């Protein structure tokens, strides 16, 4: 993915973190894992996927001229719905993509 740096509740799963406050412009759609990994790298966070990537990839779309990486991640998380979830660990600085694959 590529970013231009300038109902499920995810309050505890995706809390705020300093590096995720950074603002960015994003115009992209495609594999959730691709953009999520790009955001994590951009925010200096480790990225890891838990579970197994679904047969049919979870696609998401982000169109914003200015948004925080944190809000973009929450947008992406919602879009994934029951198909997957994003966890953000502020102390260890890890972004986790968990495929709810069962």
Numbering used by the authors: 37 to 42, 66 to 161
Show the paper's wording.
Intracellular replication of L. pneumophila requires functional Dot/Icm T4BSS, irrespectively of host species. It has been well established that L. pneumophila translocate more than 100 effector proteins into host cytoplasm using the Dot/Icm T4BSS. The complex is supposed to contain two outer membrane lipoproteins, DotC and DotD, two inner membrane-spanning proteins, DotF and DotG, and one outer membrane-associated protein, DotH. The outer membrane targeting of DotH depends on lipoproteins DotC and DotD, presumably in a manner analogous with the function of pilotin in targeting secretin inT2SS: the outer membrane lipoprotein pilotin is required for the stabilization and outer membrane targeting of the secretin. In conclusion, the present study revealed that the structurally conserved DotD/N0/T3S domain is widely spread throughout outer membrane complexes of even distantly related secretion systems, including T2SS, T3SS and T4BSS.
To clarify the structure and the molecular mechanism of Dot/Icm T4BSS, we crystallized DotD without the first 20 amino acids which contain the signal sequence for secretion across inner membranes and the lipidation site, Cys20 (DotDΔN), and determined the structure at 2.0 Å resolution. DotDΔN is composed of the compact C-terminal domain (DotD domain) and the N-terminal disordered region. The N-terminal third of DotDΔN was invisible in the electron density map, except for a short β-strand (Ala-37 to Ala-42) that we call the “lid. The DotD domain forms a βαβ sandwich fold composed of two α-helices flanked by an antiparallel three-stranded β-sheet on one side and a mixed three-stranded β-sheet on the other side. DaliLite database search showed that the DotD domain has striking structural similarity to the N-terminal subdomain of secretins, which are outer membrane pore-forming proteins of T2SS and T3SS. Thus the DotD domain and the N0/T3S domains of the type II/III secretins share remarkable structural homology, although they are poorly related in amino acid sequences. The most remarkable difference between DotD and the N0/T3S domains of secretins is that DotD has a lid that makes β-strand addition to β-strands β1 and β3. The lid is located on β1 and covers the hydrophobic cleft formed by α1, α2 and β1. The side chains of two hydrophobic residues in the lid (Ile-39 and Leu-41) stick into the cleft.
